[PDB]
Amino acid sequence: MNTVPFTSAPIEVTIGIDQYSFNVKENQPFHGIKDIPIGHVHVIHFQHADNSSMRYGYWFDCRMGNFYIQYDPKDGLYKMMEERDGAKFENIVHNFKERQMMVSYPKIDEDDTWYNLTEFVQMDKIRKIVRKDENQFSYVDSSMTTVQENELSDPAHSLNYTVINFKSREAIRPGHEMEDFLDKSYYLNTVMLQGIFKNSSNYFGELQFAFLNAMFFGNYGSSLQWHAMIELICSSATVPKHMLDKLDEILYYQIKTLPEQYSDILLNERVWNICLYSSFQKNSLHNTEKIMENKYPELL
Amino acid sequence: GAMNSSNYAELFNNDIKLFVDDTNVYRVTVHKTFEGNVATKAINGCIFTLNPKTGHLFLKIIHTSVWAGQKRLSQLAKWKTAEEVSALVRSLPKEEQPKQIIVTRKAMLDPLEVHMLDFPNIAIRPTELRLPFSAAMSIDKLSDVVMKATEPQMVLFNIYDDWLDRISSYTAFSRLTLLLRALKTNEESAKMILLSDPTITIKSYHLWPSFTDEQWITIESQMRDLILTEYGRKYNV
Numbered sequence A: 001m002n003t004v005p006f007t008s009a010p011i012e013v014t015i016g017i018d019q020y021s022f023n024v025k026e027n028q029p030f031h032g033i034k035d036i037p038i039g040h041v042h043v044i045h046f047q048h049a050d051n052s053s054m055r056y057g058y059w060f061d062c063r064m065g066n067f068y069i070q071y072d073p074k075d076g077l078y079k080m081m082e083e084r085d086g087a088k089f090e091n092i093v094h095n096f097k098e099r100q101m102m103v104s105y106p107k108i109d110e111d112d113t114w115y116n117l118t119e120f121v122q123m124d125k126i127r128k129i130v131r132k133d134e135n136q137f138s139y140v141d142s143s144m145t146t147v148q149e150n151e152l153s154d155p156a157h158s159l160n161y162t163v164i165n166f167k168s169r170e171a172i173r174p175g176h177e178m179e180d181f182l183d184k185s186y187y188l189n190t191v192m193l194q195g196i197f198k199n200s201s202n203y204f205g206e207l208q209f210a211f212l213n214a215m216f217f218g219n220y221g222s223s224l225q226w227h228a229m230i231e232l233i234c235s236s237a238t239v240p241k242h243m244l245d246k247l248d249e250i251l252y253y254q255i256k257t258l259p260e261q262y263s264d265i266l267l268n269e270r271v272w273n274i275c276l277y278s279s280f281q282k283n284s285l286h287n288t289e290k291i292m293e294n295k296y297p298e299l300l
Numbered sequence B: 001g002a003m004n005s006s007n008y009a010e011l012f013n014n015d016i017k018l019f020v021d022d023t024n025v026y027r028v029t030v031h032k033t034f035e036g037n038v039a040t041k042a043i044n045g046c047i048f049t050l051n052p053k054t055g056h057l058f059l060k061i062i063h064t065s066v067w068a069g070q071k072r073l074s075q076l077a078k079w080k081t082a083e084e085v086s087a088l089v090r091s092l093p094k095e096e097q098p099k100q101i102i103v104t105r106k107a108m109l110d111p112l113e114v115h116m117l118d119f120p121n122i123a124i125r126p127t128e129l130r131l132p133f134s135a136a137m138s139i140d141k142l143s144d145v146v147m148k149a150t151e152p153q154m155v156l157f158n159i160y161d162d163w164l165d166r167i168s169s170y171t172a173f174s175r176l177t178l179l180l181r182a183l184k185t186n187e188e189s190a191k192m193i194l195l196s197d198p199t200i201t202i203k204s205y206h207l208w209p210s211f212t213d214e215q216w217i218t219i220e221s222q223m224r225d226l227i228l229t230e231y232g233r234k235y236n237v
C-alpha cells in the first residue's frame, strides 16, 4: 500500500483519486492519500472551488517512484513531483500518518471497479500518449487537444492517441473501397492490431485510457478517440472471439461507472445505436447492451 | 458545402465541375414468377456525369452483367458509380480533371469520397437542388444507346447540342433543366411538344430539335405550361 503526501492545501479544491473524490477546504490540514493499491495505475485529479474550469490531474504508478503533491502559487495549480531521497520521503509519510493527516484510499474489498477500468492500461503506454519524458507521471487536463484534432496547436501539450480515420488511405485498400469501408476488419486486424498496436491488450489499454480521460477531465478529444476505437471493432465483421468478449466487459464497467448526469455529453448517440443495433457485432455485446438499455434507454 | 439556389452561378464559372447522377444506374422491371412470387429483372443503366458549363456529358453505360451474382444491388450501385467516376477522372488529363464533383443524391457522398481519396483537392459536394436528371432516359438517343449496349461502354454527348453558339451556359442549363423537368412530370406531353411540328428535325449529331431562337421561346413556354398544369392536375388547382 503506497502513499502520495501533500505538502499542504492552500486553496479549496475537490480532489479525486481514481473514481473517489473528497472536498478540501482552503488551508485545511490535509497531507495526502494513503493505502493506495499497488499493481494498478492511478490518477489524482483536481477541480478548484473558485474555477470549475480546468479539471486537471496526474497519471502515476507508485512502483515507479515516490510521488507527492505541492501547490505552486505562481502557476496556480497542485503539481505532482518525484522525491528522489527515499529516506526523506519515508520520514515525511510516517510523520503525516502518525498525525493522521491523510485520507485512506477507500476501496471496498468486494470492489473490482478500478481494476476493471484499468485492466490493460500501462504507465509506459500512457507516457507515449502524453509526452513529457523527464517525469514518471503524466499530466492531463480538460483542454488538451489530440494529435488528430491538431490536424483538423501546441504539439508538446497534446494527446498523441493513435489516429483512426475511416475515410483515409490507411483504412481503405485501393481496389477494396466498398469492401473495406463497409467491413473494417482489414483496418482493425492488419493495420491497427498487427501493424500499430501489436496486440489487442495495447488497443484496449488506449481505449480504456481515452475513456478515463473523457470521464475524469471532460476531455472532448479523448471521448472522440474512445468512440472511434469502439466503432472500429463493432464495424468489423471479423474480430477474434476473445476480443469481443473482453470488449463487452470493458464497456460494461465504463457504462456502469459513468455519472448518470454526464451521459448526455459523454455518449455519442450515433456510435452506440450503430454498435448495439446495426453493426456486425450487434449481437456480441450482451452485457453492455443490457446495462445501456436499463441505464440510458433515452439515448437509444 | 451544399449547392443550392443561393450559389447557382457558381456552376457557370471557369472552375471545372461535374454533376453526377446515379438514379439510372440500377434499373429493374418487377414481375411475378410462375409460383406467384415477385422477382426483379435488371435492365441496362447509365451514370449521368455532366459538365454544366460546357454541356459535355460522359454517359457510362452500366450493362446488366455487372450485377450477375452480386447481392445488395442498390448499395453496390452507388459504389460502382463512384468507381466509374473515379476511373473517368483518372482517365482525364490533369488540366481537364474537375475541381468539384456535385452528386445529385446525398447517398453518393461517402462512396465517391472513398473512391477519390487519391484526389484530396477535388471537392465532393451535395446539392439542395432537385435536379431532373433522372429523366435523361426520356431523351430518345440516350435511351437507345443504353438499351442496345451489349457490354460496358462510355459514350460522349454534348447535351446542349450547338446552343452555346447562341446562348450562355446559364441559359443553356436552364433550358436543359426545363426540358428534363417537363419530360419527368409528363413524358408523353413533353415529347409531343418537342416533335409536334414535322418540319423541325433533330440533326444526326444532336439530341434535341433544331429550333430557331423564336421557336425555343414558344417551346419553353409550352413546357412551363405543362409543368404548372400537371402541378394542378396533380394537386387539383
Ligand SMILES: CS(=O)(=O)N(Cc1cccs1)C1CC1
Pocket (backbone or CB within 6 Å): B055, B056, B057, B058, B156, B157, B158
Ligand atoms: C460534341 S463535342 O464536341 O462537344 N464533344 C466533346 C466531348 C467531350 C466529352 C463529352 S462531349 C464530343 C467529341 C467528343
